[PDB]
Symmetry: C4
Subunit: 249 residues, 4 copies
């Protein structure tokens, strides 16, 4: 290649083809969250905006294990939380409070196509400290000047997020957004990892922050949406290899 | 759905049908504990009250790996510890001291149908600090005002537990109770996770407690028995998918 | 049962039958160490005294992954380190320095039939602190008054161990001994776990030691060789289920 | 055996045979990194010098998951970064900045045949502290006087590395080099582990360094290139058993 083609979604011939791709991609993302162990109980939601109606969203149904997510399980929800399509008999239900956090962000930011939230271990533990993410590794520079902190309702979270790619919700955990499902997933994986790294390092000693000019330089390379798409790609390759036959149903 | 149906056990046509469901559910719970790595050596017991005789209990047999538990292995024990049914030739034996902790609680609290105890890593490590669980995450609010601490015999533990869903046993580990096997399991999973979270955060820095009104609000949503049932449900879905064919024997 | 039969090895009809049992049991133990992740590089040795000649020992061959150990791979070594039987062409070799640590202990203590050593993560990290194991959990009471600490050659280790079940070797890791392979394995699993627990708890706060009378009481229940045999049993059950077909070859 | 034969690569009849061996070995190494969880996003590169042209290198193609690496995926790159052979249609691309770090080292040190770099969790976290690796375990003595620290461009890293086997790159992670792929891999595995160990121990208390004469003694045994080859060998045995059929394609 041909790197450019690898940093963007494939071309879609029809809106129906795009919808089919996006639903499978959302399921793959949910399966990645289970494979990484990012899920806890029934908390967590991953949404993608429908490609035909911008006020409709595909989401995981409430209570179904991320590890068992399939395309047939996804439900369609309108902006106000009404379940209007998809799913299986017996679980055409959405976690409303959780969904309306996403809905508020999708409404505020038209370019945001996907949002990820889960009560992952390290993000949760780090969020209990009410500290900003320290920019102490090359990988963390994806978040330089681009991660919010709420010292904590849907409106309040959307306002706090502004135009940033991610937010640390105090005493709660992590939420990320993307122009693609893929980039939102990359940002969640990377943020959970850097929270893990900070908990390890801060317990052991005193970190040295990356000098800000170097952090800015690295952000140009790692922090934009095409870079996010590419940085997520090996996780999607692997989950398709491991569980694609299962989750495509 | 139909969320209400998902937060309660299925209806049982006969007492025999209920017993068959409960034995399989107890085995699934034991298999979840092994899959989560909550077990250590031969410590640990999970009990469920028999649906016909309130003074009889199904329990794992002493020394059998949780990872290999099957319905045929479970033994029936009366209130005073006599093995009176079930099991396989050669292992119709109960860990008595451990069982009588459960027996004392079941006797004191008729609504408690299931009790979980295991020497899980993070609960054990946290219990060695003799500190109450800090309410620092949304998930931890399931335990707001509802987790005991014993600064440590069966009677003493039952008295310390009072009407709460869980107890941290100093220098020992965790024990949880439920009106269902499912809720007892949810509380154990959630408590082990929050102990892990507190060990991570306390090593790294100073946590910020959730403001008490917010904790109380979240407890109303996460802390009751139907919520416990629902919060456990993905773990039972997954373990059935992974190992159901094995453990149903 | 029938608990007594579960706390001792089976009866052996002939010395040949005993040797076959012990070789398979040693392989199972080595496979458990790999499954627990206790191994690192090519470090580590597990030995069992031959049942016919007390000056001969079965041991893993140098450089073979614990994960791939089979009965056919084990080699027979005399007291002075000469490889005198067993193994496969191309790897009839023993790690001599490591083996002679075991040899010195086997010589000093005729009742010691099995010895385990591996550079496991938590034992290694804890050993770098040059501190005695704190008795802060019920499980740790298996080591109450019965674990040595060397502030560190084979003779020096044997002298430091005295009649105890285990030793923490400063800047090195853990070594355990048993009257059976099973009990030596239980002590290693339990000691590695308690080192993990102490590292977690000490990083987070101040532990509270178990009161010594309570520790002594619990040691009577957990610390003797029959209890060790029983406490190891679920690990052997599981590894046989997972990998027995492989490792029996 | 026959230990000497186990500490060196097999003899190669032709340059073509050597190239085939080395490509498979590089893929096995990449698969080990995935199996150990050393990879993160699309970061990381492992290179081996071509056996016919010393200015040509085999490397993983940019963006392909380490877990899915196969011999057919590897690409051939010249000293200046031009992709000149190998790979599959659509991913004949190299991460240039990352590769030129390797290129600078390969140019400076003709004996270095293989270089490993990945953004592994513990190396990354430890590198954020800007501290030298403490020599506190027997395993760590492989790095006694032989690991660099850059208080951080390709030239700067090569200069900082000097003739040492490994370097801790501040705020970045780990890089190792070897006269063989195998030894470079051993050094990476061992360095990542010792970073993990130091983070654990430093959080818990005060480590005791190994006395320098003892560290020097142990380095003679663990720190040379033949020892590295042997110390890596169980990881290659295991990954071939688990995934060889996949990655040989
Ligand atoms: Zn949430
Ligand atoms: Zn207990
Ligand atoms: Zn050793
Ligand atoms: Zn890098």
């Amino acid at each position: 290649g041909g790197l450019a083609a690898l940093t963007k979604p494939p071309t879609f011939a029809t809106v129906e083809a795009e919808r089919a791709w996006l639903k499978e991609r959302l399921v793959a993302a949910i399966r990645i969250f289970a494979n990484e162990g990012f899920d806890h109980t029934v908390a967590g939601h991953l949404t993608v905006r429908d490609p035909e109606n911008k006020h409709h969203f595909w989401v995981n149904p409430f209570g179904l294990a991320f590890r068992l997510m399939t395309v047939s399980d996804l439900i369609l929800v309108n902006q106000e939380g009404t379940v209007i399509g998809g799913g299986k008999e017996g679980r055409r239900i959405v976690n409303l409070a959780g969904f309306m956090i996403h809905s508020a962000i999708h409404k505020a930011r038209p370019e945001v196509q996907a949002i990820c939230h889960s009560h992952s271990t390290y993000g949760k533990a780090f969020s209990s400290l009410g500290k900003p993410l320290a920019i102490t590794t090359q990988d963390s520079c994806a978040f330089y000047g681009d991660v919010a902190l709420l010292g904590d309702e849907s409106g309040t979270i959307a306002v706090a997020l502004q135009q940033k790619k991610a937010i640390i919700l105090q005493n709660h955990g992590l939420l990320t957004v993307g122009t693609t499902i893929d980039s939102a997933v990359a940002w969640f994986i990377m943020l959970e990892k850097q929270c893990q790294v900070q908990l390890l390092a801060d317990a052991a000693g005193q970190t040295i922050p990356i000098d800000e000019p170097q952090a800015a330089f690295t952000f140009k390379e790692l922090g934009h949406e095409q870079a996010g798409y590419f940085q997520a790609s090996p996780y999607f390759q692997v989950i398709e290899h491991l569980q694609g036959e299962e989750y495509r149903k």
